[PDB]
Symmetry: D3
Subunit: 283 residues, 6 copies
């Protein structure tokens, strides 16, 4: 589901203002006469397209700009270098001044979508979902979460307010898996999912017995993981997390866990290369 | 030179608000009684430290929090996994709730500094500087620029307003390298540096003759580059750019150019791993 | 857990600015930067909520200290004539910062009091009283807090917190089970899913679909009872709609998990307080 | 006079942001390739309509949304349960995601207007006017003041900066207080004094103040004060005023009364949005 | 009465942001391991001091900065060139990066105060008062209004919402205009009317308005109007008022005059920050 | 190049809000949503600047159209009694949105006019007239524009735009050459570097150090002339300080690149306009 102007406008404005504090001298010195012009957006690298309407919105907040999409490209579609993703039509000053900010969004989000897509394939198991985390670029979580969905991934909680996750230390402070779970439930009844991070087979048992929604198996071995699965017997949903990357992710293939999660999808994504070229004046 | 609260506060607040829309239920359910506590910040990966005071400021905007720095770590210092970078002292709720946002800044910036440092070494020529670009994460340019300086790199223009750069299309619109340069100068006299992107040996000549400040040699071969240098004869500063990464950067070693620039330093930096662990209550 | 400056400061500042566009002429004309004391009195029985909010209004504006002779705190029961707080500072800060502070305190204490009253009227510990998103615009955080203070509980703060498939959602999709399926496909595992249901058939459909919470909307006791057995613990159960002081007792003793009321936040009478007894200080 | 985007937009945006921090998951999950949809706004309780354009603006900031108003309803009109106030047309996403915030405004403002209208009717004297106060919901004063006008009430000062009012501590020679106000103020502020005793009412009237407030002073007292003031100032009666009480002032020669409870503790008026159908 | 952080902070922050978009490169380039430094604020031109605490606040929002005031200067005090108004102590980075913004405020406000003071002296009659207008620099009205008070002037309405003023189009039966204002307004707004002819001045005074504005009406006219008005209203003379002109009103029984040029076209007053030295 | 809505809208809105806190009572009491026309007249000779700003104030507030009989634009010379614009819309929008619009227009036209006057007084094309950072807080953008409109040129907008090593910077470091060296080391290649210099010795030091721009601060003509030859085109030259209408002509014919004046922006008299001649429309 696409991102809306309500959601993105303030962020894009800020970004435009970051890149232009007075004016775009280089563009304004050369270009004048205010003729309409056309520029093309080209993919320069293979991957997955994400953030296209975000890209567009940067231009549209700045000036009156229209678009042409010859190949009907949309977020999710596979890209190959040289592909004509969009044509952008408007005044020269608007096209050149808005370009870098627009691309910066598009490159970043397409990079994440691409990487998410790659992880899914590397895993090669539909039955196991690929989830993101809170290890996101500050103030862009919304956009990054979106890119992950686009790439075929799924969203974990957005927030510390969304859902409860009882980590390593939380159990210790209470001194029982069961008590930590109980206090969580008492504190925020009914309307919050509760998850627990567990390093131990005993703790996984304790937690499943307590009736939690999701159990996180933290950096556990395959032997350990397999035992836990049988032990839990579908009493909770099972997430594997930690030390999960392109090389590692395939180890989970075929297990009866519900999902895995990776921070790298959002904290360490390479951006995907695009360029805007072929500027011509309209007749 | 370190980042100031005036510069970073609004951004960090926004980030905190992004991660906490109502409250941190998971932390609030388990922890109460408001005892002071101590937590340790550990490096988990080798590289360069950047964003330490940013990390700190996240806690300090939220609550009364103090720090201890046993090893006197500061931005720029080399890190090795297991290193104790900081101890953070304050109320448990403040420590756990602020953790992820604080780390997200620290990881991201240290990742950039590390990568910048790596590029500098790979180049192995002091006489040639490593510069960043405008291919930055929207609304964090300031922070990323800083991380590049920390890693031993240098800053290009911050902005479209900072300085003039006449790219591929700008020359064509005017139809002469010399005329584009002239119009730039006429438009913003004296107080703006002027740079031109050049793909051709002829154009490099034209530009040097015109008296520009900086000539950018775009994706040119070493043979081409070397000819241009001799041809320009120190009439302008020389930047090489395009297709510059870890593998490629060493090709510039020993040339009489002033600097090279890379977008990857900011658009495709891996974050550097840290963790906050060892939570204990103070006596 | 109390509200904090990080959470409340921008709101209180805005409120102060609303009440003082240039200066407080009437107070300034008569006054000194000469210390004074004023007393905060409860003028009506109920539950105290928003005391640190009240305090913060003064503290943002000027250097002001407080005395709390009776160690009053949010959640405590109030009776008229009670001395809740003494406020000490310059006369100008006290007079100018009075109306705004009280406006917060009166409003929140009103909500807490009303929440507390609903809980008692229900007279069943086993059934919790929840709030809603029918809140006063731009004060949700504060109102949600007041409900907790009065012994109530918080429903989702937001459209982003949890999924709730209401009448209008069901209509857009045209089916209960299909709407749940889509919600489940869209936000697996980490979001609770709730459905509003008007009929027993739909309650069945929903329970079978494996939702987390079923809302029984404005259903009769007979209906409710049937639904309970029929749902058979496959989901949590909430009752909602047409729930007020008179009505709430009807849920007493049922095997539902909670009830929810918009009135707690959209129609709460404010609780009366006054600030009086200005002594001068030396 | 209706409220404007210039006045309300920032507030509504903040309200929308309060209700949607990331996304509207429930609505986004049901997203489909359908076209535009229509939903109806129904009154569910009798009273007075206030905040209709505010209601509308919540949708219009968010997305492209149009309206149909079959019965030509406008702020000030009387409502009866089951009344079709508006039809809202636009994308399903916009209608459902904007609903609660829009209704929260409408319900709150219609509640105040209704209550104001009820107080007016209860007092029954057109000779008097019913005024509001500064006992308003923080950061919504502008909207609440509007609702009071809509319900047939009148606005007192918006602010501590609008006009001068002399209080208890301030009251502590009350002719000297008036003098200082007028002097300390430029000659562009109305001055009002709150008075408990008849002696003070006279001093004040002699002082040439603009408005004299008779505080919780009973009918005999009030009646004497009126005569004594002899039209030298405007007269406000205040304190201990409620639906039950307001009738005591019926027919007195005073100019107005004021009530905090109008904004202070107004019930919201019930509405609902239902009947979602896709357009053809 | 001095300005407050609650009033000024957002404005100053915006000003600082205007002057520093990324960083203060010039100052950061010279960063060293020195300690605290001291810099002096000097008056460089004679006039009246206004905006001193505003000046101070610019530094204090940014960083930890302290002040020393050897001569106990405060807003309203007369200045002579070479006067040491303040010493500013803090880190070099904070002093230099905050300087220009802080001075811009101080210079602007001291300029207005000075000009106001000059107008007062020029008119020479304490019986009259000198008032400002709404002809203010956008988004700084609050600060400019303050400076006018500091220079011995007085404040007219801050706003279109503060008070009522009847204009030319509005003037087009002028007793009916007054009636509608008072009716359309609640009984809490001062009403003023701008009048060109003596007939209108009388109608208005009879109407019981609070302030009558005699517009660009000359001394003979003015003098007749005064007598005719007979203290039924306050009298303002306005239009065609300047340093040269203001003296014509000396000794008339009018209450005040107003000038746009006070805020409209005030020269800023020169100051400088110099004498940077490191502390020991 | 004209100012734009993206650039100006938030400022104008703030300005409107400053002037109208609730409503325009005086205008509303008398009025219609009945169209009317008003004329904008120049009341004083000078240069027109800020016309589209003027227009935008109305356009943000309501639906308003304009007629420009004489095709006036920013930069054009004005003479009193000139009809600059006709404004058409509802009476309420015209009366309420009048003072703010004019305040912008008067201010900017004042700056443009003053800039234009300085250029003429200088009477040397070869020497440009620059502005400074001595601007009215929060209007720099607008003032910088007005200077260009009057035939002037813009200096750095910001502390972030370019490096300028002033008196106070030189003191902190204790040397001219060392300050330049540090600036050069800190921001190589992409930032211009300028130094303020009071003495010939320092001018030499600076030129030798290879700066981009030397500022000759409040120096005598004799000094200036010596400096020019001595600098020998190693840097651009700016003269600044104590530069006004009377003084500016002294620079005529020197081989300097430009002069700068704070007065253009900190001490500009506003240019008089009025809005009158309200016809009603049908």
């Amino acid at each position: 589901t696409d991102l809306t102007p309500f959601q993105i406008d303030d962020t894009l404005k800020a970004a435009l203002r970051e890149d232009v504090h007075s004016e775009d001298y280089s563009t304004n010195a050369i270009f004048d006469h205010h003729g309409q012009a056309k520029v093309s957006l080209f993919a320069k690298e293979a991957g997955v397209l994400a953030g296209l309407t975000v890209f567009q919105r940067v231009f549209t907040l700045f000036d009156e700009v229209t678009f042409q999409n010859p190949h009907q490209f949309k977020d999710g579609d596979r890209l190959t270098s040289g592909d004509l993703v969009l044509e952008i039509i408007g005044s020269v000053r608007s096209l050149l001044t808005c370009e870098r900010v627009a691309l910066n969004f598009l490159q970043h989000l397409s990079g994440i979508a691409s990487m998410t897509a790659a992880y899914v394939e590397a895993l090669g198991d539909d039955r196991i979902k690929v989830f993101d985390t809170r290890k996101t670029t500050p103030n862009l979580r919304l956009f990054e979460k979106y890119a992950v969905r686009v790439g075929g991934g799924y969203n974990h909680r957005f927030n510390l307010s969304d859902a409860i996750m009882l980590k390593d230390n939380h159990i210790a402070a209470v001194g029982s898996v069961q008590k930590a779970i109980a206090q969580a439930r008492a504190y925020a009844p009914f309307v919050k999912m509760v998850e627990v991070e567990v390093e131990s087979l005993a703790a996984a048992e304790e937690a499943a017995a307590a009736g939690v929604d999701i159990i996180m198996l933290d950096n556990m071995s395959l032997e350990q993981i397999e035992q836990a699965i049988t032990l839990i017997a579908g009493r909770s949903r099972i997430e594997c997390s930690g030390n999960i990357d392109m090389t590692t992710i395939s180890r989970f293939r075929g297990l009866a866990i519900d999902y895995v999660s990776s921070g790298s999808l959002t904290h360490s994504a390479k951006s995907l290369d695009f360029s805007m070229k072929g500027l011509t004046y309209l007749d």
